[PDB]
RNA sequence: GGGG
DNA sequence: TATAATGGGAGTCTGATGCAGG
DNA sequence: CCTGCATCAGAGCCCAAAA
């Protein structure tokens, strides 16, 4: 069909590669395909460079390189191996008391390598790391809270690359300096810099007050040494001020470019602010054998002018998108990589010191151990490092571009407060202000905007188009915060005719303050009105017309869609849909220009005008993490002719390259029965029927076989007291047969396991005995089916030990793994959502017969309850459903860009020519208006819907025009009583599917030290019944159901057998007993040395261990 | 949870499978008295798969 | 009601030389009509055998007698040079909808 | 240092094999197997020894270790108790006795308390022949017949009521 | 990080 | 069981209450 | 006598919780 599309916005540049933020980093940080001495300092260059030389002897170093990885993407993926690279460096062993020179390149261990699409393979698992948005370094001048006249100054470096400092104006009028939350007065440290009393007054003095407060006689009285190790005593109380360890106390502290590290964006701001220019990235230097300044004057400086009130000096925004930055992969990475460094070099100068000062080499000097656990606990267990989105491609891309406030160097829950989580006048543009988690997290964690890119500093910038006179040029300038705040900024649907500015008001922004302004005055424009929304929010069209609360639901839940086997691209789009299946990498181009030369199931081969008949593999049902299928399907035929660019095979959740999240399905909005109650869907069988909303789905099983120390656990067929009715879909091995309908119970992988000392007690030998069975040596531990859950077998992979490649963790022989597939028909239970928020769980399944219909005999698909548009206030879906209406009749699809979009009126121009086809057919066709239809435009004219007067094709067009149409019962075959609004609208099936959530136990596993049951649907759990709970069944005094809970439903252990005893043997439960736990917290008091002893009325001790704890 | 117009005010629909493991003990015992099984242990076994 | 192709386990198989996936071969199978010109008769059994560079449509079934395929034009599967394909589909008469957990035919 | 104490001399073997494999894998550019470290390490060593020493050196994990990042998960919640009898199985004890002892009576009950002296209910009293020689009724190769023809009315007994046929599992 |  | 070796390395915000201090 | 000032103990529920 045609694709018709609105809006007047030309765009003058393309959405930046989106998973750029994840790529490019790493890249940068690794700089493998950079040849060494070309390196830039920086990344893992810049780590080396820092820890090195090594001194006592000097370890030097010269270059590193990276290897080649072991093993391909897909091969880790397979073993749960890690995708890493070989790191190897050549180093340079001087002895700095001979001469003698060893070199050698010693091995580091590996490190991992990022994919094509910005994901890591760790252990088997593909997993992102999340960028951490946090305060940049930097010196900030802010208001002092208790003093309304004084202000503090702080400089912060990089997180755990320095300590915090504080310069408050103590209210007895000298100025104060604050490190490691320990104070002093500032005019002793000012000494120790070598300054006098003359430099202070001559530089500052202009302030009468203020800088004669600051001045201190006793300080004066000592030349820079004496004053350097008066300050260490105050720090350090206890140790001995000898002058060489305090010089290294406070070198290390502050002029040390090793223990001390302003950022590289810590430099420009300082610099930029105070008016200096810094040599280094430290607060002072050791020169000449004393100590030079370089910030600490300029900070006084600054402070000082602030109290003063002198022109050019302003307190700092700390929530200002200019001075917060992003901490991205490689740095995240290189910050973990500078601590796995440092600790070898601890285990380096050990070394240099214990066996022998001379045969050694650098082979044997460097343990890489520090290293590699330093790197492996970043990927495997930082808080930053998450199990990767895959349920659909959106999904991942969506959460490589994610920032974070939370983790490793940022805020906790607990710790946490409104400053940080509200929107800030500067996240226009940069930071998505819709997509955000709702609850808990609220602005700590956002996205990024789609037009945004973070700069080498750190700092998110946004594309703007320069404005010259009233002229708009095509040159594009990405704008930090702090550099955007100088300009004049125009809206971007600002009226234009050419490339001139077309209205004589213009709507703009100074500061993000909106203001009307003449085109004189106009400095530049924004890109597009997609560069303020995430890539996520993007995707909902009409978002002009929807309630931001309700927006937020509409993008967060595109993330859940699951792919759909019959998956279709919504009729109306906002055309960025075709752009992230692209960049996503979930389907499949052309490399160059050629022809087809094969096209399967399995694999698509391409002969290229270079001659080269490239074959593409196609990815065919891969289990992502969430289970959902990833697979890829071709979407060309033998001998059809492509061009560079063109699709090859369509991706999950994908249809010729739009991206399909879900189905666009006929649906009503009208009540129905009270199934619509409160959210509840009802659908049409219809649905079902044609394989609408299923999905194919996969849950991976495994099993090990281990030695023991009572001898081998064995994979085998042959397991004990088993029918041959049980064991029909097994192998000869043991292992179930691959295309077998396995349910719950069923053996997957038969396993047997020898039996413990519990070898069968005396009630057992003699029953074995009378059977005349000997008593097996193994006991039946196989492999089967959880509660729930069962599908076809699709897929085996057995791994023993002494099989070529595969050694597994010690003590393993073999593990199994069986892959189980089902498909998913819709079910009540599972749960829809449109793109603006309307979410709602399916509550009936109608026949055909019982759902409304048009006249001409078409049954609706979805009926939405009309209650939960008004409260919402999300109008985009109804605007959505007409646009809808018209391509039903008129067979197209549109692209409505969001705030620059289809209008009312060209709407209803589109919905006029559908009611020629829905209508015209009909008047040719031999028929007449209906009966009923007559009955309802009487009814529609006392509403005001359609005018008094007129032809029935005149009022129902009227209606048509107004998205509602005559609706009959299938029930009845009665008209309903008015016209409903009926259109096409795109609606996506959930990950929430009740297949997943419905659990219940009877009785199960029990926790070791308090006897409860477990938790969660995986352990067979029990129910939490918490404080909360007790208090219901409490103010209902409902006593005996709330003991039992206490009690035999819990760790009652005399209680909870004796209980489920009477009900198999049908008599009444007994009155409950002692509850263990409580026994447990009788213990643990005494284990603190408290007598806690029950007593009776008598107040006599009760003994509640029944005589077992008592000599 | 899913919307039940059809309910009385007293009434809740539960899923079969879920009442079967909540009142599993009552399930054997009743199996037996009638007679789907022979005894309370054999009856259990039939339960599982 | 039913489907077996030769070398095919399960559902989720997929055929050297066919472009469709097996899932999408049975939903091209679930649109087939089979008119039963005999009252008496309620389960047959259509064979199929292709080759080649053909794209298999309804007609290539072979012919039994007394059952008429009424849209003899739906495609089936596209096989490229060495595609093969052989199956046995099972037509039934029945009223309703019958979901295929529920047969397991 | 360790939870599970070591024999000083067995801690030294350990730290042999640590250092020899962080050669080895200093050398070898990657990770070495079993067979690789059984070869550095001389005479004596097979992988199959390498790899026991390396289940032994094994140091336990706290049952404490937090799962996931909101604070308020164990480790030791996910572990079941495998030592106390479930409901169903303190049951099913319950439940055994009571069928064994109404099957013993209803052949006879001398000739259950022959076979019962014979293995024990709450005791296990199996030996084989000597002490047999003691309070049955009888002299000494008579109580293994009787044993048979107890175990054999058994047996034709089972075949009724079967109800003991379940309990094999 | 995700559901109400 | 024996050259001599002699002092360490490292990280929010609220309200209530019991304490050394103009 | 009274007031700064620190040290301490608080910060919602249930479910997945992908180790
Ligand atoms: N205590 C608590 N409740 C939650 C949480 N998450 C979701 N909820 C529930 O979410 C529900 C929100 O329901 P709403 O749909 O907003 O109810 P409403 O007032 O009718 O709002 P509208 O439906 O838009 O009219 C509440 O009833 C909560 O019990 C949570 O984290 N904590």
């Given at each position: 069909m045609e694709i018709k599309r609105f809006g007047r916005i030309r765009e003058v540049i393309p959405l930046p590669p989106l998973t750029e933020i994840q790529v490019e980093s790493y890249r940068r940080a690794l700089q493998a395909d950079v040849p060494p001495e070309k390196r830039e300092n920086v990344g893992i260059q810049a780590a080396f460079r820092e820890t090195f030389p090594i001194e006592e002897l000097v370890l030097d170093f010269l270059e590193y390189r990276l290897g080649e990885p072991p093993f391909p993407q897909d091969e880790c993926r397979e073993k749960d191996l890690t995708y890493q690279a070989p790191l190897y460096a050549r180093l340079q062993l001087i002895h700095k008391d001979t001469g003698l020179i060893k070199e050698d390149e010693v091995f580091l261990g590996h490190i991992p390598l990022m994919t094509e699409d910005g994901s890591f393979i760790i252990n088997g698992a593909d997993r992102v790391i999340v960028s951490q948005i946090h305060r940049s370094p930097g010196v900030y001048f802010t208001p002092d809270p208790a003093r309304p006249g004084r202000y503090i100054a702080s400089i912060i470096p990089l997180p755990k690359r320095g300590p915090w400092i504080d310069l408050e104006v103590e209210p007895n009028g000298v100025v104060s300096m604050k490190v490691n939350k320990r104070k002093f007065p500032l005019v002793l440290l000012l000494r120790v810099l070598g300054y006098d009393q003359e430099t202070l007054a001559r530089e500052l003095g202009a302030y009468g007050e203020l800088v004669?407060?600051?001045?201190?006689?006793?300080?004066?009285?000592?030349?820079?040494?004496?004053?350097?190790?008066?300050?260490?005593?105050?720090?350090?109380?206890?140790?001995?001020?000898?002058?060489?360890?305090?010089?290294?106390?406070?070198?290390?502290?502050?002029?040390?470019?090793?223990?001390?590290?302003?950022?590289?964006?810590?430099?420009?701001?300082?610099?930029?602010?105070?008016?200096?220019?810094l040599s280094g990235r430290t607060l002072a230097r050791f020169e000449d054998g004393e100590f030079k300044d370089e910030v600490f004057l300029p900070t006084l400086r600054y402070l000082f002018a602030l109290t003063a009130g002198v022109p050019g000096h302003e307190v700092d925004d700390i929530d200002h998108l200019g001075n917060r930055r992003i901490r991205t992969v490689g740095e995240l990475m290189t910050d973990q990589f500078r601590v796995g460094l440092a600790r070898l070099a601890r285990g380096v100068r050990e070394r240099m010191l214990m066996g022998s000062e001379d045969s050694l080499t650098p082979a044997k000097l460097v343990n890489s151990r520090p290293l590699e656990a330093a790197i492996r606990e970043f990927f495997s267990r930082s808080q930053l490092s998450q199990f990767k989105d895959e349920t659909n491609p959106l999904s991942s891309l969506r959460h490589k571009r994610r920032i974070s406030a939370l983790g490793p160097g940022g805020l906790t829950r607990e710790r946490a407060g409104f400053d940080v989580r509200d929107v800030h006048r500067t996240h226009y543009g940069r930071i998505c202000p819709v997509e955000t988690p709702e609850g808990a997290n609220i602005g700590l964690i956002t996205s990024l905007a789609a037009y945004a890119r973070v700069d080498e500093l750190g700092f998110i910038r946004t594309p703007y188009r320069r404005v010259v006179g009233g002229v708009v040029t095509d040159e594009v300038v990405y704008m930090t915060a702090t550099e955007e705040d100088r300009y004049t900024i125009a809206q971007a649907?600002?009226?234009?005719?050419?490339?001139?500015?077309?209205?004589?008001?213009?709507?703009?922004?100074?500061?993000?303050?909106?203001?009307?302004?003449?085109?004189?005055?106009?400095?530049?424009?924004?890109?597009?009105?997609?560069?303020?929304?995430?890539?996520?929010?993007?995707?909902?069209?009409?978002?002009?017309?929807?309630?931001?609360?309700?927006?937020?639901?509409?993008?967060?839940?595109?993330?859940?869609?699951?792919?759909?086997?019959?998956?279709?691209?919504?009729?109306?789009?906002?055309?960025?849909?075709?752009?992230?299946?692209?960049?996503?990498?979930?389907?499949?181009?052309?490399?160059?220009?050629?022809?087809?030369?094969?096209?399967?199931?399995?694999?698509?081969?391409?002969?290229?005008?270079?001659?080269?008949?490239?074959?593409?593999?196609?990815?065919?049902?891969?289990?992502?993490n969430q289970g959902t299928a990833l697979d890829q399907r071709p979407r060309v035929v033998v001998g059809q002719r492509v061009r560079k660019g063109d699709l090859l095979a369509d991706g999950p959740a994908s249809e010729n390259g739009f991206l399909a999240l879900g189905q666009n399905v006929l649906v009503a909005i009208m009540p129905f029965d009270g199934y619509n109650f409160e959210d509840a869907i009802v659908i049409s069988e219809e649905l079902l029927k044609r394989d609408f909303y299923t999905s194919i789905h996969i849950e991976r099983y495994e099993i090990e076989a281990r030695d023991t120390k009572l001898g081998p656990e064995r994979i085998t067929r042959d397991i004990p007291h088993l029918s041959e009715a049980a064991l029909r879909d097994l192998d000869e091995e043991g292992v179930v047969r691959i295309g077998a309908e396995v349910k719950p119970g069923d053996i997957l992988v038969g396993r047997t396991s020898f039996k413990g000392?519990?070898?069968?007690?005396?009630?057992?030998?003699?029953?074995?005995?009378?059977?005349?069975?000997?008593?097996?040596?193994?006991?039946?531990?196989?492999?089967?089916?959880?509660?729930?859950?069962?599908?076809?077998?699709?897929?085996?992979?057995?791994?023993?030990?002494?099989?070529?490649?595969?050694?597994?963790?010690?003590?393993?022989?073999?593990?199994?793994?069986?892959?189980?597939?089902?498909?998913?028909?819709?079910?009540?239970?599972?749960?829809?959502?449109?793109?603006?928020?309307?979410?709602?769980?399916?509550?009936?399944?109608?026949?055909?017969?019982?759902?409304?219909?048009?006249?001409?005999?078409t049954p609706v698909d979805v009926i939405l309850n009309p209650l939960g548009v008004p409260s919402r206030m999300n109008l985009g879906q109804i605007l959505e459903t007409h646009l809808g209406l018209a391509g039903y009749f008129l067979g197209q699809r549109y692209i409505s860009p969001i705030f620059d979009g289809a209008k009312e009126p060209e709407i209803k121009e589109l919905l006029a020519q559908a009611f020629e086809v829905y209508f015209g057919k009909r008047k040719g066709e031999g028929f007449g208006v209906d009966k009923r239809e007559v009955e309802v435009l009487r009814r529609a004219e006392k509403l005001g819907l359609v005018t008094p007067g007129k032809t029935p094709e005149e009022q129902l067009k009227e209606l048509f025009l107004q998205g509602k149409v005559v609706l009959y019962d299938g029930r009845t075959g009665e008209?309903?009583?008015?016209?409903?609004?009926?259109?096409?609208?795109?609606?996506?099936?959930?990950?929430?599917?009740?297949?997943?959530?419905?659990?219940?136990?009877?009785?199960?596993?029990?926790?070791?030290?308090?006897?409860?049951?477990?938790?969660?649907?995986?352990?067979?759990?029990?129910?939490?019944?918490?404080?909360?709970?007790?208090?219901?069944?409490?103010?209902?005094?409902?006593?005996?159901?709330?003991?039992?809970?206490?009690?035999?439903?819990?760790?009652?252990?005399?209680?909870?057998?004796?209980?489920?005893?009477?009900?198999?043997?049908?008599?009444?439960?007994?009155?409950?007993?002692?509850?263990?736990?409580?026994?447990?917290?009788?213990?643990?008091?005494?284990?603190?040395?408290?007598?806690?002893?029950?007593?009776?009325?008598?107040?006599?001790?009760?003994?509640?261990?029944?005589?077992?704890?008592?000599? | 949870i899913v919307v039940g117009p059809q309910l009385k005010l007293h009434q809740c629909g539960l899923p079969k499978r879920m009442a079967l493991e909540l009142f599993k003990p009552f399930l054997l015992k009743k199996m037996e008295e009638k007679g789907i099984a022979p005894n309370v242990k054999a009856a259990r076994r039939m339960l599982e798969r | 009601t039913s489907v077996?192709?030769?070398?095919?386990?399960?559902?989720?198989?997929?055929?050297?030389?066919?472009?469709?996936?097996?899932?999408?071969?049975?939903?091209?199978?679930?649109?087939?009509?089979?008119?039963?010109?005999?009252?008496?008769?309620?389960?047959?059994?259509?064979?199929?055998?292709?080759?080649?560079?053909?794209?298999?449509?309804?007609?290539?079934?072979?012919?039994?007698?007394?059952?008429?395929?009424?849209?003899?034009?739906?495609?089936?599967?596209?096989?490229?040079?060495?595609?093969?394909?052989?199956?046995?589909?099972?037509?039934?008469?029945?009223?309703?909808?019958?979901?295929?957990?529920?047969?397991?035919? | 240092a360790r939870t599970i104490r070591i024999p000083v001399h067995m801690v030294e073997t350990i730290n042999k094999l640590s250092r020899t494999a962080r050669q080895l894998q200093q050398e070898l550019g990657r990770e070495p197997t079993y067979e690789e470290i059984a070869e550095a390490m001389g005479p004596g060593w097979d992988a199959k020894r390498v790899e026991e020493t390396l289940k032994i050196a094994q140091e336990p994990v706290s049952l404490e270790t937090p799962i996931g990042d909101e604070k308020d998960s164990f480790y030791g919640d996910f572990i079941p108790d495998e030592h106390l009898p479930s409901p169903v199985d303190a049951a099913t004890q319950s439940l055994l006795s009571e069928e064994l002892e109404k099957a013993l009576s209803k052949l006879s009950e001398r000739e259950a308390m022959v076979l019962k002296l014979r293995k024990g209910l709450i005791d296990g009293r199996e030996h084989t022949l000597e002490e047999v020689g003691a309070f049955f009724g009888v002299t000494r190769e008579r109580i293994r017949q009787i044993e048979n023809k107890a175990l054999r009315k058994l047996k034709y007994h089972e075949s009724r009521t079967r109800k003991l046929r379940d309990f094999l599992d």
């Open positions: 004669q407060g600051l001045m201190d006689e006793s300080v004066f009285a000592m030349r820079p040494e004496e004053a350097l190790i008066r300050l260490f005593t105050l720090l350090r109380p206890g140790d001995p001020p000898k002058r060489d360890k305090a010089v290294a106390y406070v070198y290390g502290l502050i002029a040390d470019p090793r223990r001390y590290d302003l950022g590289e964006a810590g430099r420009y701001k300082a610099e930029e602010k105070l008016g200096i220019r649907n600002t009226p234009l005719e050419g490339n001139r500015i077309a209205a004589e008001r213009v709507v703009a922004r100074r500061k993000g303050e909106p203001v009307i302004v003449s085109p004189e005055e106009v400095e530049f424009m924004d890109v597009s009105p997609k560069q303020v929304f995430s890539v996520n929010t993007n995707l909902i069209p009409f978002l002009e017309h929807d309630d931001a609360n309700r927006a937020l639901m509409g993008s967060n839940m595109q993330t859940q869609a699951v792919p759909l086997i019959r998956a279709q691209a919504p009729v109306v789009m906002t055309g960025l849909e075709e752009r992230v299946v692209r960049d996503s990498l979930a389907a499949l181009y052309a490399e160059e220009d050629g022809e087809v030369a094969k096209v399967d199931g399995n694999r698509i081969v391409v002969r290229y005008e270079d001659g080269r008949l490239v074959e593409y593999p196609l990815r065919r049902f891969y289990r992502s000392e519990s070898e069968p007690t005396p009630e057992e030998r003699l029953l074995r005995s009378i059977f005349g069975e000997k008593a097996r040596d193994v006991k039946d531990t196989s492999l089967r089916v959880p509660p729930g859950e069962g599908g076809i077998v699709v897929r085996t992979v057995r791994l023993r030990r002494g099989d070529p490649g595969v050694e597994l963790k010690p003590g393993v022989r073999e593990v199994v793994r069986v892959y189980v597939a089902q498909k998913r028909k819709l079910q009540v239970g599972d749960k829809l959502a449109n793109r603006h928020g309307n979410k709602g769980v399916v509550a009936k399944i109608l026949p055909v017969e019982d759902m409304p219909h048009l006249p001409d005999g008209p309903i009583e008015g016209p409903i609004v009926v259109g096409q609208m795109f609606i996506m099936k959930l990950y929430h599917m009740v297949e997943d959530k419905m659990h219940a136990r009877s009785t199960g596993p029990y926790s070791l030290i308090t006897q409860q049951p477990l938790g969660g649907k995986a352990q067979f759990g029990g129910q939490r019944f918490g404080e909360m709970e007790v208090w219901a069944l409490e103010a209902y005094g409902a006593a005996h159901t709330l003991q039992e809970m206490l009690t035999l439903k819990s760790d009652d252990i005399e209680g909870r057998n004796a209980a489920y005893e009477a009900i198999i043997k049908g008599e009444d439960v007994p009155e409950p007993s002692v509850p263990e736990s409580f026994r447990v917290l009788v213990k643990e008091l005494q284990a603190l040395a408290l007598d806690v002893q029950t007593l009776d009325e008598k107040d006599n001790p009760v003994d509640i261990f029944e005589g077992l704890a008592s000599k | - | 077996y192709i030769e070398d095919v386990l399960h559902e989720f198989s997929t055929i050297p030389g066919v472009k469709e996936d097996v899932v999408e071969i049975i939903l091209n199978l679930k649109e087939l009509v089979v008119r039963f010109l005999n009252p008496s008769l309620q389960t047959v059994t259509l064979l199929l055998k292709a080759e080649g560079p053909k794209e298999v449509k309804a007609r290539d079934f072979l012919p039994v007698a007394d059952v008429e395929i009424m849209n003899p034009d739906l495609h089936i599967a596209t096989l490229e040079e060495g595609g093969r394909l052989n199956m046995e589909v099972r037509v039934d008469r029945g009223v309703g909808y019958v979901p295929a957990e529920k047969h397991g035919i | -």
